[PDB]
Structure 1
């Protein structure tokens, strides 16, 4: 297994200047002819010419139109085509090849493949080599001239990058289209699509150049009525890049294409963005509310890549976070501006501190720019994406908007049209830093440790107030635990956005302030502080760290009620919950270990419950924020704070705390569930796909959260509400009715009702599958078997497999059944999936990421299943390398 090392980067001895492709799609095979106009680079030392080429069937290869012969002049081992250096020209030459590939049976969904009746490519990271021979790395930038031919009846729509410059008929019912893309691009941005596609289209006029851009959104005919929101989102994305960053689209046309079979969310191929249908298609009758923010996010993300990834690209794959972290950050700015809801930022923090913090304390922990890799298909991690985004966001926090925009424009102007590295971005940010500090000696050299140092920093606080001096001090300490990547961790540049709240009136005591912590510890002193404040720390979650606020629950309640910052209010609530959870967990654990016949549990803080009621009853307070405060922290957030976590004890702990709060607040919950109905379920715009109301969707989130709490509590006659909820036109509601009916004898009645509502829309049926999978049912294992036999069967669609199994893996009580039956089940699915889709098989390993954080019995059970998977003779490269790293082999 070849290990690639970041320090080993060297430019190629060759240059590829022009790619001319002929892709001829036939019924049982696809023939790919390619001419590469090539040259010898200044770094050449007379080496063999080695092309990447994976799974290609060679018909012929030639240099300068002279056919090469296997064995004497070249070897091919199904991975590398080697042309011996004595046959490689010493000046400009043409390399040509004709190969046969087979998209119909390409179930791994990389390279050229068939998704239902659509032929589609996926080339990032190293998938272009599955289509034709290439030096398949992003610094080999070239011009592309691409012709595609196909049966006209089956494939009337043909698309590739660039301008369509010819269309022509071919004998035998075939036709072709030629696409010329003159701007240089790396091969991972190549794409081709062929199918019987239907579309919506619009014309966008850019802000400054006033160029007309044609926008096309494509799907199969059955779902063309689900394209409208995506088109709206694309217009919004273009306007935001113009308005915030001053950046306009440079091409005449942008196509977005939905396909049913896709390994991830979407892909930014230049002018031809290709999407998982679940991240492009929606309608109000056939989609849950989550689809609307998802499509906005993913359309936005792929659009923002046109600058941060496409026009400025990567020198090498170790720079992945330079385009992904930065594009996630750009999408976050966009979505926060579009939704105007605090829950957009809170949702990203919620994901980071559960999923990404877990990764960063697991054996898989890596920095956002790793030092090595074996599988690029395993490289696309929440660390690279989401911690990367927080690292890109910290530059904006440090510089402020005006200087951040100045630094970003420096980055774009200096690197437009070229490859770049993480240092290039830090350099541009540093220039803005010098401007802001009015100090040409200022630098961001320490900031580079965010790219190289793995692990989550811990930031802790102590305070001092001198009432006579009116002097307040915040003493701050930072610590990152040593791990496999650094034995000694260095202090980072941590920006701490802070406010000081007057506890008597709730008002701000200082102006906007960002503490710059650059040492292992520092003391920040504030004068003329007239009363002892409550500090509001890491406003907006200003650095990706474990925050240890050292506040009392009384102080946290005051912030929860009266602070100005949504994150600090949410975090103060989180911290109150965590203190309770750890305390009750240990009490339950003691009772279990000591086999106690009786014991006591510490009750939930009554002033905390009073504060929740106060916020819930405030009509001016935000419904999305309300849904967060009545929900306990994510299990994957909690696990970062408990060694040898017994999942049964945690489930008992959560149950006690929810029952404590519900015993006091259930009448409030029910009153709110009823009073929110009119605005939450308003149908005024149900048949307008352009009208999306994120506040209204948050009201539905709150109602569906409250209904779940009330159903679990067996609130009197709540089943009446559940049944009426099942009749709502909104899938978010009627799928919720299925979920919350798990606690009643009507579950299988609603199972059948909602199945019939879902079965005729591919994506809605996947949402139904997720709802069943996550149902809190004692018979969930029997239910999963029913889904397997009746709905899923032997589908190779990743959306189907992920929908059936991943939600169930979050069932704390049942997935972690002490028999190990849940670990056995998912391991069987992983091994089965690995036969045809190694990338998705590795995604299905997600529940095992926390294996060494569980109690010792469950550690043993998970490890046994992982070792069983590792012993499969046919295990893929992806899955083997992932499980070897995860099990510390």
Structure 2
């Protein structure tokens, strides 16, 4: 396998200044003519001119209008076009190619492809080379003049980046449109779209310069009624970047386009953002609640890339976190501001501490700036994105809002119109830091270890209180486990946002303060502390770490009740659950291993249950927050604390704990389920796709969480509630009805009822598939076969394949069936999918990431399947690299 190393970056010996494309779409072929206005750079040493170009059929190649011939002036091996150095000019030259590509057969959804009746591109990271020849790396920045031609009836809307400067008719029922994008860009930001698209539009006026910007959102005709919320979210995004960052949009027009077939969420192509339809389109009668926050976040993210990625781009792909971590942090500030609910930040944290922490203790562990790769596409990871966002967020915590905004403006301005590296960002932040500290010798050199050091730090605490002196100390230690990337791990710069709670009255005892831990250990002392406090640690989840609070459960319950910080209250609850889960898991495991005839289980703490009841009964407490407290920690979080995990024992553990709590609280749960109905299900705004009440949504979330707990419990006559719930106008509720009906004989009636409600909207049907896939059914494998035969069939749509299989892989009892049948099922899907879409096939490998955390029989079963997949003939490079790394061969 072919390996790139971060330290080996060098600038090209060539420059591409202008790109002039003609993309002529026909039924059975697309012809791409391209003129590159090129030159030799100051780094040239008379090397061969080598272009990336994958799967292209050459019609012609020339330099300065001299035809070049294969075997004489060039070679082409279907990956690289090499122009021998003797035929490479020494000054400004025109390189011309014409190639034929086939979007109609491109099922990998990279390069130029067909999605239903739309032709669309996806170029990040390495797709532009599947369109035409290029030096396809992000430091090759150029300006683009793009003409698209097509059949007018089929493809009446033609789009590429930038200003539309002409439109023209062509004989034989064709037409064309020409675009000029004035902004220098890397080729990964190139896009083109051709389709029978409908739109909604609005005009936005920029806050400071009063520039009129035309905003267009596009879909296929069937779904144009589903565009409004995205348009609204775009306006919101624009205003947020103006308001917080002082950043205005920089073209006369911005287009967003939904396509049905897309490998990931969306893409920030300049002036022409392209979305998975599932991340752009919604309506309140045909989408679940969660669609709304997803569209807000994805529109926002792609918008924020207009500065953090587009106006300031990447020197090389090792810098990916500089655009993705920073953009996710911007996205997260935006969504926290727009929703005004504490659950938004909690959701981010839950994502990190489950999936990213698992990744960071897996064989795939990498620093947010990797040192090497084979397919760049495998490093679009939750590490680079979500840990990167937390590292980008820590600057804000450290500097505070005012000095953070100063540093960010230093960065964005210095590096405008150019490439940048992670070091450029740290330098900007370090200038702000100097200013904030009033000290020109202060530096953030140690901060750079957040970019280079893999693994999750562990931060642990000890406390002491001197009652005579009224003086409190917090002794803090950090540790990172050695790994394949570093045999010796250095201490990080860890900001610890802290409060102190008086346990006798529940009140705050200090101004919140942010402790800067920079050594392996340190002791922070507080004076004028009138009584022994309970510390409120890592408020807001102030660094991406494992926290060992060394608190008793009684102290944790007091924080849950009385602290101000949602994260700390939620984490204190999480920690109580984790202590219980590990204890009960150990008890079940020992009983199983020793084949005991009888044994004991530690009961759930009764004062903790009382605290849950108190918070649920408090009408002034937050519904979203309540839904987090009645749910156990996710399985992927739990697994970070158990080695050789027996998944059946864990399933039994979780069931015990849920039943202990329900035995005490189910009447409370039922009473709340009923009492929340009127406000949860009020139809205010049901016809308004410009406004979402996120509090009301959290009330539905809470009802639906309670209904699941009551259903699993077989609470008396709950089936009557499930049936009434199925009649609700909200899809979040009627699809819940299907899920929770799993525990009753009514499931197949609700399966059919909901299928009929879902089948005529593509995205609703995919939400129905997810609902079925995740259902807690003993007969889930027969259900999956039913979905394969009746609904999924031969679909190559990644949303369909993901909907049918991923939820099922999170079924702890059934996916991990000790036969290995679950592993075998998903591995066959992965291998099948890899033959046409390697990126999606790698996505589908997610369940295997934890393989070396399982009990030794399940490890062996997973490993067996992974090595079977590795033996498949013509396995993609994407999948092969992934699986070699995951199985500790690479």
CA distance in 2, matches of 1:182, 1:730: 45
CA distance in 1, matches of 2:342, 2:433: 28
* SS of alignment partner, residue 865 of structure 1: helix
TM-superposition CA deviations, 1:22-57 (whole Å, max 9, x none): 000000000000000000000000000000000000
CA distance in 1, matches of 2:379, 2:13: 26
TM-superposition CA deviations, 1:370-412 (whole Å, max 9, x none): 0001001111000000000000000000000000000000111
CA distance in 2, matches of 1:575, 1:778: 31
* SS of alignment partner, residue 184 of structure 2: strand
Of 177-186 and 324-333, the range deviating more from structure 2: 177-186
Q: CA deviation at 1:528?
A: 1.1
TM-superposition CA deviations, 1:618-641 (whole Å, max 9, x none): 011000000000000000000000
CA distance in 2, matches of 1:2, 1:643: 34
User: Which residue does 2:216 correspond to in 1?
Assistant: 216
* SS of alignment partner, residue 807 of structure 1: helix
CA distance in 2, matches of 1:295, 1:708: 26
Q: CA deviation at 1:505?
A: 1.2
Of 500-509 and 437-446, the range deviating more from structure 2: 500-509
* SS of alignment partner, residue 806 of structure 1: helix
Q: CA deviation at 1:534?
A: 0.2
TM-superposition CA deviations, 1:45-97 (whole Å, max 9, x none): 00000000000000000000111011010000000000000000011000000
CA distance in 1, matches of 2:133, 2:192: 16
* SS of alignment partner, residue 216 of structure 1: strand
Q: CA deviation at 1:413?
A: 1.1
1:235-314 equivalence runs, <5 A: 235-314=235-314
Q: CA deviation at 1:686?
A: 1.2
CA distance in 2, matches of 1:884, 1:183: 40
CA distance in 2, matches of 1:338, 1:547: 29
* SS of alignment partner, residue 182 of structure 2: strand
Q: CA deviation at 1:693?
A: 0.5
Unpaired runs of 5+ residues, structure 1, are none
CA distance in 1, matches of 2:639, 2:779: 26
CA distance in 2, matches of 1:773, 1:57: 42
**Residues 1:39 and 2:39 aligned together:** yes
CA distance in 2, matches of 1:138, 1:815: 41
User: Which residue does 1:824 correspond to in 2?
Assistant: 824
Q: What root-mean-square deviation, in Å, do the aligned CA atoms of Structure 1 and Structure 2 show?
A: 0.4
TM-superposition CA deviations, 1:440-499 (whole Å, max 9, x none): 000000000000000000000000001001110000000000000000000000000000
TM-superposition CA deviations, 1:101-148 (whole Å, max 9, x none): 000000000000000000000000011000000000000000100000
Q: CA deviation at 1:852?
A: 0.3
CA distance in 1, matches of 2:834, 2:148: 31
CA distance in 1, matches of 2:789, 2:851: 29
* SS of alignment partner, residue 377 of structure 2: helix
CA distance in 1, matches of 2:184, 2:591: 67
1:323-402 equivalence runs, <5 A: 323-402=323-402
CA distance in 2, matches of 1:213, 1:555: 54
Give the aligned length. 889
TM-superposition CA deviations, 1:170-208 (whole Å, max 9, x none): 000000000011221100000000000000000000000
* SS of alignment partner, residue 580 of structure 1: helix
Q: CA deviation at 1:506?
A: 1.1
CA distance in 2, matches of 1:484, 1:378: 18
* SS of alignment partner, residue 829 of structure 2: helix
CA distance in 1, matches of 2:78, 2:476: 56
User: Which residue does 1:568 correspond to in 2?
Assistant: 568
CA distance in 1, matches of 2:338, 2:162: 30
User: Which residue does 1:770 correspond to in 2?
Assistant: 770
Q: CA deviation at 1:520?
A: 0.2
**Residues 1:790 and 2:790 aligned together:** yes
CA distance in 1, matches of 2:141, 2:242: 27
User: Which residue does 2:799 correspond to in 1?
Assistant: 799
Q: CA deviation at 1:873?
A: 1.1
Q: CA deviation at 1:428?
A: 0.3
CA distance in 1, matches of 2:652, 2:727: 33
TM-superposition CA deviations, 1:569-601 (whole Å, max 9, x none): 000000000000000000000110011111110
Q: CA deviation at 1:684?
A: 2.4
CA distance in 2, matches of 1:450, 1:332: 20
CA distance in 2, matches of 1:89, 1:642: 62
TM-superposition CA deviations, 1:701-731 (whole Å, max 9, x none): 0000000000000000000000000000101
Q: CA deviation at 1:691?
A: 2.2
CA distance in 1, matches of 2:126, 2:8: 18
TM-superposition CA deviations, 1:836-872 (whole Å, max 9, x none): 0000000000000000000000000000000000000
**Residues 1:470 and 2:470 aligned together:** yes
TM-superposition CA deviations, 1:337-364 (whole Å, max 9, x none): 0000000000000010000000000000
CA distance in 1, matches of 2:137, 2:835: 27
Q: TM-score, normalised by structure 2?
A: 1.00
Of 747-756 and 176-185, the range deviating more from structure 2: 176-185
* SS of alignment partner, residue 475 of structure 1: strand
Q: CA deviation at 1:764?
A: 0.1
* SS of alignment partner, residue 39 of structure 1: strand
CA distance in 2, matches of 1:333, 1:263: 26
User: Which residue does 1:409 correspond to in 2?
Assistant: 409
CA distance in 1, matches of 2:295, 2:370: 30
Q: CA deviation at 1:224?
A: 0.2
CA distance in 2, matches of 1:601, 1:504: 32
User: Which residue does 1:165 correspond to in 2?
Assistant: 165
Unpaired runs of 5+ residues, structure 2, are none
CA distance in 2, matches of 1:267, 1:417: 19
1:623-642 equivalence runs, <5 A: 623-642=623-642
Q: CA deviation at 1:791?
A: 0.1
CA distance in 2, matches of 1:286, 1:818: 38
CA distance in 1, matches of 2:91, 2:549: 65
CA distance in 1, matches of 2:807, 2:193: 32
CA distance in 1, matches of 2:163, 2:591: 71
TM-superposition CA deviations, 1:401-449 (whole Å, max 9, x none): 0000000001111111110000000000000000000000000000000
Q: CA deviation at 1:689?
A: 1.2
CA distance in 2, matches of 1:598, 1:185: 69
Q: CA deviation at 1:613?
A: 0.3
TM-superposition CA deviations, 1:310-360 (whole Å, max 9, x none): 000000000000000000000000000000000000000001000000000
CA distance in 2, matches of 1:56, 1:329: 38
CA distance in 2, matches of 1:837, 1:24: 25
CA distance in 2, matches of 1:505, 1:599: 40
CA distance in 2, matches of 1:834, 1:418: 36
Q: CA deviation at 1:251?
A: 0.7
CA distance in 2, matches of 1:303, 1:90: 40
